[PDB]
Design a protein around this nucleic acid. Structure first.
Ligand SMILES: [Mg+2]
Ligand SMILES: [Mg+2]
Ligand SMILES: [Mg+2]
Ligand SMILES: [Mg+2]
Ligand SMILES: [Mg+2]
Ligand SMILES: [Mg+2]
Ligand SMILES: [Mg+2]
Ligand SMILES: [Mg+2]
Ligand SMILES: [Mg+2]
Ligand SMILES: [Mg+2]
Ligand SMILES: [Mg+2]
Ligand SMILES: [Mg+2]
Ligand SMILES: [Mg+2]
Ligand SMILES: [Mg+2]
Ligand SMILES: [Mg+2]
Ligand SMILES: [Mg+2]
Ligand SMILES: [Mg+2]
Ligand SMILES: [Mg+2]
Ligand SMILES: [Mg+2]
Ligand SMILES: [Mg+2]
Ligand SMILES: [Mg+2]
Ligand SMILES: [Mg+2]
Ligand SMILES: [Mg+2]
Ligand SMILES: [Mg+2]
Ligand SMILES: [Mg+2]
Ligand SMILES: [Mg+2]
Ligand SMILES: [Mg+2]
Ligand SMILES: [Mg+2]
Ligand SMILES: [Mg+2]
Ligand SMILES: [Mg+2]
Ligand SMILES: [Mg+2]
Ligand SMILES: [Mg+2]
Ligand SMILES: [Mg+2]
Ligand SMILES: [Mg+2]
Lengths: 123, 86, 80, 82
RNA sequence: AAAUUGAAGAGUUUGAUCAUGGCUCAGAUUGAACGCUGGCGGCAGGCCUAACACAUGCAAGUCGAACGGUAACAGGAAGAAGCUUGCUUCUUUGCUGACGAGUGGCGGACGGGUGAGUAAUGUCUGGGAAACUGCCUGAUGGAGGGGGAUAACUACUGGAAACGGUAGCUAAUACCGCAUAACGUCGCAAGACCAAAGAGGGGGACCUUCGGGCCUCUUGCCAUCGGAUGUGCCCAGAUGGGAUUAGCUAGUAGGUGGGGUAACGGCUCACCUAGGCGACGAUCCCUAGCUGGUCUGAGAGGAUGACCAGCCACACUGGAACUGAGACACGGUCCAGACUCCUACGGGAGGCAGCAGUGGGGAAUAUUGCACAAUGGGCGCAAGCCUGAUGCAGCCAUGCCGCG
RNA sequence: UACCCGCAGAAGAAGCACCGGCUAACUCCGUGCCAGCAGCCGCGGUAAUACGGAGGGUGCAAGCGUUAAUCGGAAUUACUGGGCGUAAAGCGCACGCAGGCGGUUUGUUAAGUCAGAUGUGAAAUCCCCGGGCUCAACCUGGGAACUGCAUCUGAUACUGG
């Protein structure tokens, strides 16, 4: 349950470390993004020699949130923080080449198959 | 491991490791019993414990788990101290 | 076969140890002048019989501490 | 262990061997303990070609040094020559 | 007999001069490049840059004479037949020449690569004393009598793969008691205590349970004291620069005692003393593997550390120990990091600074070759197998020398 | 394979830089402070041996030039082996700790210094005399050298105690 100004950690080796959500994509007046949703981000901290830089403006898919995901029998899976994976602005495909921490099967899209394969763990 | 024998060596060294560990843990136990008697001031318990310990620090030396010199110091050291008290 | 050094006691403070300075003249490798050089050795003095300023005869032995590989042989001259 | 063998010097197509006593693990042309003969397989044989300090070879054997197949041959050959 | 018995100057300030002083040239040298040109050969050299990243092959195996063994192929065999009656194909059985997979032994600590780190648990010279040391070697004795397991395999079962789960079952030079036990370890001594393993080759009376006994020799196993080689440790001197770095230090310096190592040691811990280092350059900062030697110079020096050889250090990065005589392991293990590959999505796998080769960087540096024939290494009684060590071949005028 | 014999025919095998002084090698034409050269000086505005072409010549030769790079010449970091009045260089002056140096005699010591002996200073490399590849490079025997270090024993003039 991510909105504008929200800060997210980063679940890849893109070099970003902290990003801010500056837009929830996918509809007029849309309020929140959750696991599986794409956001627009600015990069607030990045490592020295990575694929991206501080102040760069791009997209990312949310892959872990504190609000969690509901499953069909009523269950909940919650994470201790909010993380995302950086995506090319145009192709919306991953910038990084590795993924860190657990992800959820909600990502099983044509689009995010690469993220679940790379993920250490899939919940 | 990549090479055929390298694989085999890792397997053998693990077996040996669990063998040695077992015998080594046993040995230190019997050494520790002697130091514990000494620290309670009993000649007999400590001599008795030294007599049980002797043959096994000796044997583990013969078996390469430790060198001869280590076995000797243990016997020398404990013998020194137990005599110094009773 | 008794290899040995002679020097004077610059410090006698330590318990059973002493610092000895061995001084010698050496030809300068490039400019030929003869220069004083000093070698300080931590030496063993069981019984602490060596006083500062004493001139003492020392010998090399096994390690006695992190920095002591020498022990006292005997005092030569004392209390100048 | 310690072995007596040929370290191959000389040039390409013109082998020349230096007989040496050495720790068998060191490389063939590497660290040795003592040089003890030489062997020219390309000697004109009009004059010399094979020279062995048999006294020091034996001394080293007496202390357990082993001996190459090729040095073991040279020694039997040189013992035959004189 | 001989073996450092060797040393040059020119142009350029001035109208001209002498002095001062820099710049410049003649010389040797090079792991070179580029431009033009280019016939052959012998010997040598060949990523100096990114310790940048690496597809693919290959670079560490071997022993059936330790062991249960057969699945391959090779014969052999009572007995099935090819039968055209000595030629034979298959059903069988390890009977044996061998041998996949497995246990076991020895080697994977050598050989080969690199110079990142390190101004010192480094190197060089010269000395010390407290130690271990596979294979090889001399000496003297052992090698007795037992026991419980297990891989392979069999049955059932999970995986896409990697690789597993159950219960069976079995061998040994795997593993453990027990005995034996000193010129061994502990101990003043009296005493106390410690090991092991078989496997082959051939054979005369003699004979059985036809396995062998027994006879004999080879070989391996155990103990102890030596030799040889290897390694660990300690001290002194030397081994770069900087003060636009002057103070540094609590395991710090020493002492006692316990622990610890193969061994001396603040190696470690407790307690005690308050020391220890430093202008003869400590501390901090920059740089760097050291040497034999190499180039230059008459020399003294200056510069330098490819190729060869010695020592050290490293093995994707940081950390760790396990096995072992030896490693904190170059093609081993574990954790963490960076990165890459496989996947049926659940999970797996790897580390060229070995030899070729690729991308990248660069002014610039080679073939994904042949062979174990020779020398040398590993295993084996041997035969032999393995060996990108090595021997060779290919490429380049890169250099030296020879010839056209 | 090395090497030896035979066959064919001069047949298939010459380029690079330079020529003003330093520096071996000179003329013409073109250009005209342009285009250009240039290690240093310095060439180019109408005779340019200096630019560019040509002929001629010099030096090298399967190479030749240019660039890079170390040492040399450079006595230009001067230990061997230099300087500071006017050329770069005496601190504006004095006191003074550390340090360097220290008059003269005797005795002593024996660290410096000197002598001898012994061990070590790996091999290769360098050098000398030989040997082997048709020669040479290359390979190789023996020597000499490693001018250094260390221990012991002496010498005692000089320096130090
Ligand atoms: Mg103790
Ligand atoms: Mg003039
Ligand atoms: Mg060309
Ligand atoms: Mg070649
Ligand atoms: Mg290479
Ligand atoms: Mg087999
Ligand atoms: Mg055994
Ligand atoms: Mg027993
Ligand atoms: Mg037995
Ligand atoms: Mg102690
Ligand atoms: Mg470096
Ligand atoms: Mg090499
Ligand atoms: Mg090379
Ligand atoms: Mg080397
Ligand atoms: Mg490591
Ligand atoms: Mg061990
Ligand atoms: Mg190492
Ligand atoms: Mg590798
Ligand atoms: Mg390029
Ligand atoms: Mg002229
Ligand atoms: Mg010109
Ligand atoms: Mg003209
Ligand atoms: Mg130059
Ligand atoms: Mg000079
Ligand atoms: Mg001058
Ligand atoms: Mg005047
Ligand atoms: Mg002046
Ligand atoms: Mg003045
Ligand atoms: Mg006298
Ligand atoms: Mg000749
Ligand atoms: Mg020679
Ligand atoms: Mg010689
Ligand atoms: Mg030499
Ligand atoms: Mg005097």
């Amino acid at each position: 349950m991510i909105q504008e100004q929200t800060m997210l950690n980063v679940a890849d080796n893109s070099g970003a470390r902290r990003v801010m959500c500056i837009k929830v994509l996918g509809g007029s007046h849309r309020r929140y993004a959750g696991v599986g949703d794409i956001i627009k981000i600015t990069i607030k901290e990045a490592i020295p020699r990575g694929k991206v830089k501080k102040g760069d403006v791009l997209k990312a898919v949310v892959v872990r949130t504190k609000k969690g995901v509901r499953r069909p029998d009523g269950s909940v899976i919650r994470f201790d923080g909010n993380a995302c994976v950086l995506l090319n602005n145009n192709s919306e495909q991953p910038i990084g080449t590795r993924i860190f921490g657990p992800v959820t099967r909600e990502l099983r899209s044509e689009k995010f198959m690469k993220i679940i394969s790379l993920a250490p763990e899939v919940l | 491991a990549n090479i055929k024998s390298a694989k085999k060596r890792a397997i053998q060294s693990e077996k040996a490791r669990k063998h040695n560990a077992s015998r080594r843990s046993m040995m230190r136990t019997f050494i520790k019993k002697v130091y514990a008697a000494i620290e309670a001031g009993d000649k007999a318990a400590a001599q008795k414990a030294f007599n049980e310990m002797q043959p096994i620090v000796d044997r583990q030396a013969a078996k390469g788990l430790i060198h001869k010199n280590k076995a000797a110091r243990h016997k020398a050291n404990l013998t020194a101290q137990i005599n110094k008290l009773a | 076969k008794i290899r040995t050094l002679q020097g004077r006691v610059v410090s006698d403070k330590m318990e059973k140890s002493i610092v000895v300075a061995i001084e010698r003249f050496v030809k300068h490798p490039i400019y030929g002048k003869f220069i004083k050089r000093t070698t300080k050795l931590h030496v063993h003095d069981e019984n602490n019989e060596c006083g500062i300023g004493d001139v003492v005869e020392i010998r090399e032995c096994r390690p006695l501490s992190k920095t002591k590989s020498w022990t006292l042989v005997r005092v030569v001259e004392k209390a100048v | 262990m310690v072995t007596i063998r040929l370290a191959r010097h000389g040039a390409k197509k013109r082998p020349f061997y230096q007989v040496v006593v050495a720790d068998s693990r060191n490389a063939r042309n590497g660290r040795f303990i003592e040089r003890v003969g030489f062997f020219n397989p390309i000697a004109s044989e009009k004059e010399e070609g094979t020279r062995l300090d048999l006294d020091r070879i034996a001394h080293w054997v007496g202390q357990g040094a082993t001996i190459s197949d090729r040095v073991a041959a040279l020694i039997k050959e040189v013992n035959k020559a004189a």
